Every structure is written in C-alpha cells, then in structure tokens.
Symmetry: C4
C-alpha cells in the first residue's frame, strides 16, 4: 500500500550501469 518508495529504488541500481561507462576516462591516455 505504498510502492512509491520501493518504485524509486529501481532508479538507484539503474544509474550504476551507466557509472561503468564513465570509467572510460580513467584508463585510456590515463
């Protein structure tokens, strides 16, 4: 009777996937 807080959770794990991409900066050329 309150999936509002849980629903938002999906957003937390989601950003993680993208976080991996940004890593590209820390490797090539440095």
């Amino acid at each position: 009777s309150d999936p509002l807080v849980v629903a938002a959770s999906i957003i937390g794990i989601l950003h993680f996937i993208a976080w991996t991409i940004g890593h590209l900066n820390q490797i090539k050329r440095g």
Copy 2:
C-alpha cells in the same frame, strides 16, 4: 506520516536528467 522519505525521491530523478549532460564526453566532445 510526513513526506520526508518521498521528498528525497525528487532528488533521485534529478540525477537522470543531469546524467545526460555528462554523457556528452563519452559520446563525442566535438
């Protein structure tokens, strides 16, 4: 009872729209 936990949710979405900006580096810095 107060929307204390909910209010934080608004902060979660903000990350998504901004994340799109940082992507400019990954895709092409022009």
Copy 3:
C-alpha cells in the same frame, strides 16, 4: 524509532553540492 531511513537522505544532499563540480566538463567542452 527508525531514523535509519532518514539518515540515508542526509547523504543524498551531499552528492548535490559536488555535482556542481562535474559541470566543469560542460563549461569547458562546448
């Protein structure tokens, strides 16, 4: 008592002030 959930919120506001720095990518690379 259950300030466990609230505590997490405090950390959320923190990421915001720092996000400002990330802007550098844009402010530099058109």
Copy 4:
C-alpha cells in the same frame, strides 16, 4: 524485517566511494 528499504541505502554509500575517483580529472590533468 523487510530490509527492502535499507538495501537501497547501501546504494547511497556506494556513490560516495566511486565519486572520489571521478575527482581525478581536476585534482590532476596529464
């Protein structure tokens, strides 16, 4: 005890840990 809400918190502390890495850009630039 329905640690569903707590699990989400773990994601918050994670950001901070990685967040310092990204800092490498300003604190140094080869």
